[PDB]
Nucleic acid binder design. Structure first.
Ligand SMILES: Nc1ncnc2c1ncn2[C@H]1C[C@H](O)[C@@H](COP(=O)(O)OP(=O)(O)OP(=O)(O)O)O1
Ligand SMILES: [Ca+2]
Length: 430
DNA sequence: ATATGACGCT
DNA sequence: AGCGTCAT
């Protein structure tokens, strides 16, 4: 009753760039705009591995982790853009730089948490309060929400997409309690008005479109974001949760897409997130541990407390390449040449990072994978990173792994290496 | 048939 | 410290 917390204390958004690498390439090359197209890496491998897909190409069944030659069988007129290759490997600089463009714009509105190359969470709680004061209790016109969906509406006693969107939005707004500045629903609404403005600024200043979710915490914000894509935003209210969760596969909730989620389903004999509400907090803790059980008990009720972390920059800067099948690294001289290649890119990214962001990495993590391990991470070791020099980094990396070689023959490497990974970590202010 | 990044556990 | 999980 009066002491039951409802998880309605913050306004949180998740902004997600639509088919991001595709948009970066389509901005650059107007001939790709409004076409089925994809971004590929490593051309000579069956036309290249597809890593991003325009929405026009998705309608043909083109997906990520399809070979371009195979995608062409579904979509013969698919256009392609290829990732830059430097020193024999894919180089994602263009996309990291485009990401900075977007993250700098979002940072003007609120403090962001960089979640990936193209996602950021936003804590809008404070900006909502401030915008609510300015508003002076005047209503919110639908015109302030031109791309917003209200999940679960319309409901109760037209047949085209936009018509249904507006119907839901009218029911939502007609019901709003603009009289109370502490109404959660009103706070989410104003949050959505801000996110409209944020998304318009991104598109104006970059050409890039995105989707967004607005709710009371990160999990619901992320869920909401995926509900109406591309180029749209979705508001998931607290009151929307019971219906939304009643048929929501558990695996759709962030952190449940893998093994834990699969064990929730199997152990408990359930399918949908809402079905969790019938278990006590102690039962969930018993099955899944103290932390996971507490988290699940609250989350199935729409409640989650993970903060939007004030962090706009990555905490690690890494470079890696796989060397599959026959290309696996079999000689000492190959291993050293590729470590050098990785180390050169790393040095380049590190030096840029030091000038831009006033910090230095201090630990180098070296990871490899020998042929056999189904296992991705076969072995991991660190050393000190004391100088941004590619030859030292590559030599150091070699030293900390050189005894993984089982070959009595000096010049050979056994078993062959199928992955090398160099990662700069443990940043200090500079 | 074939590249990153964050965080949890021990 | 080194390994595992989950995600873009
Ligand atoms: N497994 C991967 N390997 C390489 N690059 C990837 C991988 N997954 C994602 N990316 C890159 C390419 C994407 O454009 C970008 C953002 O990922 P993601 O948001 O999952 O897809 P997307 O932005 O391309 O489509 P969407 O409209 O579904 O957001 O990161
Ligand atoms: Ca995206």
């Amino acid at each position: 009753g009066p002491h039951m917390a409802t998880g309605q204390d913050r306004v949180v958004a998740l902004v997600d760039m639509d088919c991001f690498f595709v948009q970066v390439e389509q901005r650059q090359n107007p001939h790709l705009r409004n076409k089925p197209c994809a971004v590929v890496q490593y051309k000579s491998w069956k036309g290249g591995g597809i890593i991003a897909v325009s929405y026009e190409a998705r309608a043909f069944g083109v997906t990520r982790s399809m070979w371009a030659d195979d995608a062409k069988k579904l979509c013969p007129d698919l256009l392609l853009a290829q990732v830059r290759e430097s020193r024999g490997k894919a180089n994602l600089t263009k996309y990291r730089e485009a990401s900075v463009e977007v993250m700098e714009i979002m940072s003007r509105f609120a403090v962001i948490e960089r979640a990936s190359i193209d996602e950021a969470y936003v804590d809008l709680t404070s900006a909502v309060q401030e915008r609510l004061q300015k508003l002076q209790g005047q209503p919110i016109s639908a015109d302030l929400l031109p791309s917003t969906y209200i999940e679960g509406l319309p409901q109760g006693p037209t047949v085209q997409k936009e018509g249904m969107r507006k119907q839901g939005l009218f029911q939502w707004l007609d019901s709003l309690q603009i009289d109370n500045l502490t109404s959660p629903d009103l706070q989410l609404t104003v949050g959505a008005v801000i996110v409209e403005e944020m998304r318009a600024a991104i598109e104006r200043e970059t050409g890039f479109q995105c989707s967004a979710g607005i709710s009371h915490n990160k999990v619901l914000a992320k869920l909401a974001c995926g509900l109406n894509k591309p180029n749209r935003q979705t508001l998931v209210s607290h009151g929307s949760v019971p219906q939304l969760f009643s048929q929501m596969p558990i695996r759709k909730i962030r952190s449940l897409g893998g093994k834990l989620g699969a064990s929730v389903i199997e152990i408990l004999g359930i399918e949908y997130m809402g079905e969790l509400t019938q278990f006590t907090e102690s039962q969930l803790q018993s099955h899944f541990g103290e932390k996971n059980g507490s988290w699940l008990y609250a989350m199935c009720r729409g409640i989650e407390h993970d903060p939007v972390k004030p962090r706009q920059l990555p905490k690690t800067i890494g470079c890696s390449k796989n060397f599959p099948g026959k290309t696996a690294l079999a000689t000492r001289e190959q291993v050293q040449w590729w470590l050098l290649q990785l180390a050169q890119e790393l040095e380049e990214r590190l030096t840029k990072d030091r000038n831009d962001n006033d910090r230095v990495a201090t630990q180098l993590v070296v990871s490899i994978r020998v042929q056999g391990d189904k296992r991705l991470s076969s072995l991991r070791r660190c050393c000190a990173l004391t100088r941004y020099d590619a030859h030292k980094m590559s030599h150091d990396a070699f030293t900390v792994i050189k005894n993984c070689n089982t070959s009595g023959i000096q010049t050979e490497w056994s078993p062959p290496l199928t992955m090398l990974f160099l990662c700069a970590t443990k940043f200090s202010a500079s």
